[PDB]
Amino acid sequence: EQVFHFYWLDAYEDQYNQPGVVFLFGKVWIESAETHVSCCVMVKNIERTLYFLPREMKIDLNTGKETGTPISMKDVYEEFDEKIATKYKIMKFKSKPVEKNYAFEIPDVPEKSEYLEVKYSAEMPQLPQDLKGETFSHVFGTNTSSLELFLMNRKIKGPCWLEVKSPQLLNQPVSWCKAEAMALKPDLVNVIKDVSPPPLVVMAFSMKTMQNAKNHQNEIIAMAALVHHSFALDKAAPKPPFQSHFCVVSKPKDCIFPYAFKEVIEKKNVKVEVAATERTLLGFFLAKVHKIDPDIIVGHNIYGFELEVLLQRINVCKAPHWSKIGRLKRSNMPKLGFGERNATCGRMICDVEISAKELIRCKSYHLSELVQQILKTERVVIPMENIQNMYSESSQLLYLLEHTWKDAKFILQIMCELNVLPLALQITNIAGNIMSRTLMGGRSERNEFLLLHAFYENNYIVPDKQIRKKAAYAGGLVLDPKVGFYDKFILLLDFNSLYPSIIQEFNICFTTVQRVEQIPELPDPSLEMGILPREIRKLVERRKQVKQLMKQQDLNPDLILQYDIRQKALKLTANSMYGCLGFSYSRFYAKPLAALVTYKGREILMHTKEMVQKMNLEVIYGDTDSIMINTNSTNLEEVFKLGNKVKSEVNKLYKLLEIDIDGVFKSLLLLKKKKYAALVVEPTSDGNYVTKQELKGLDIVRRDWCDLAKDTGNFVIGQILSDQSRDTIVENIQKRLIEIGENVLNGSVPVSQFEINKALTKDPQDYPDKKSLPHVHVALWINSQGGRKVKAGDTVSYVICQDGSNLTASQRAYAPEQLQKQDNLTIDTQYYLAQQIHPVVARICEPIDGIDAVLIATWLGLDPT
RNA sequence: GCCUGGAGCGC
């Protein structure tokens, strides 16, 4: 024979132009060059695979009545061969009788049955999905794609080594890869698992734009990029994260670079290529991308902005070889991230803004906010305006260029900090999907793939692909809180992986629960564990192991944050598995199952409450799978004893389900359902402990309340949960607010603490009631005013100003720069004292005796009415 | 209070 090893990373198909063909992209070892290079494997002749379901008794399609003659596979085969194939234009085909299982939403389909599996070129016509005949009642697979077929049949679950037997050469090169090969049939490709993974080539880049003097155009004038040629995803990120880099700068048109600039660059020795025109800069960039040939391009706000600006300028400046940004040689450039995901076809795009949204929470996910929170450093901002002025002098252009470089380095460090790539790989190996898609975010598709693999593996027919809202079933139970402040220790118990455990504990699966608004019946405790509980069980074990590691002997603060991020990521994947059950658009939609799971949950929470009560214990709160108990005790060791005592009494009633001590609070301020604050006990040595404050649902934690309101609100909480007597406190509070009020008026407050943030659900142009929505208004401005443009999903920052236009506060919203820049605009102190600070402090103090709404208004010097 | 619209916390 003849065979070659190849490590795949990305896949792609163009069902319209090249049906039955799937392009794979990855790495191949070149011994002579002692290094891995990019490789493109084109897999052809992936055949459509259909399953025909035979009728019990034959039927006449002209009369619509039975005939008395039973059916046999030969009956079906012949019909397909004589009537179906011929009628639909299917020249050749192969077929065979197989036994498959079913357990999905199509009625009239038996659990197990014999089917006639048919296969034929994806180049020949597609049969209708609702096709039926004399010998067969239904046909599955009619529309399966080549890629899904390929990934499933060869059992490819994420990046891995493949062996390609009998590789062919290609008349002409189809990609921008070093190597290429072609397989004539998918069974030539095979997964092997005894060869370690190769390191990847990572490239992190950043760019700068500038609005042109006359014409309205966002011209790219600077790009920076860092590169690492041996970045391994099965170990710590390299230190440093890059080995090389490059910068490139160009002049808008009319401008001229400061002179000596050339020499200034030679002087300080900076790997900075200075382009004459934007077209040259774009040409230079693509050239570096092609030469560096990165397997992963990483940046910030790639999908939402950068990628689109880049492709358009590339089209405008008629730059050479746009497809080099991807790995597939193309001709026509698609636009709008679909047209985008295809543009970079073959290279995985990793957007830290997207990855961050998925892994951690922030008030905004803009780069500055991110560098601050994750890297713990400040990031200078260079406003589009200040840019022009920088071309006048050498040092300034040189500074801007260095600034672009720093963003690329930040983006790269943030990526390594959250540990995005290794996590993305791990998840992709678990779901069996495509890693570039995992990096785009979303839980649904990963779930779908995880299940598809599981069912193919178990010999099941799987549903065909088909082609915030209001709840559609009962959710979790939230107990009514006994609101107030608490001195004595509070006991918080929470079930471990509740829903996933409920699914296993009762063996809930598409294969064990009868269904068709009604809650189905728990299946016979006799039946065997279904596919769903098995897969779910696996995700829960992975998580436990990662939690086990965390428990470990003295670890790095940074490494411990990663384990925690990973652990929650696995938690999310398990819950999304439950969720997709109730996801109308899901391919494995089965509302009844979702409904039956949440049902048992509320039932279990009820019984857990009632039980804790029979033990003569005080239950002050509860949320879906938790119980809060007021021990009324001051003896910690005794509390813990009571805790493990109640734990034991609960776990005793279930096979898998396990409740545990989630925490113990020294003091607790319980305001409303899903809203409380607390000092959390953290034991040390000799029954001694440290305490840490924790917030849940308060306004202080939300993004849509200025920091001025939030910082003050946190002060109040700090005091409330304190040791000090109620008196000392109420005084300190009053003392503080009165001061806050004075400062807000004497203009001592930093303009930033006045910013309010809100994310847009839709693009600013899609809102009808516009004008009265401060965030929508300020976005419309930013948009129609300069470069970058705010779209759905972005958070908008704004402040309320004094226009001198007697409009409502909601209609006097401005950008922070629009304020600091303009003179007729000034901060509406009235608004902030009464609609921001007052509401927050009022809601917090609501249960505190001594404080009250009217009183809080007088401290801030407002008129109590 | 309802209604409409807008927020994003909590599981």
Next chain:
DNA sequence: AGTCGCTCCAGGC
């Protein structure tokens, strides 16, 4: 394009 439960605010009536 995982689920549902629970406040919050602008504004008209």
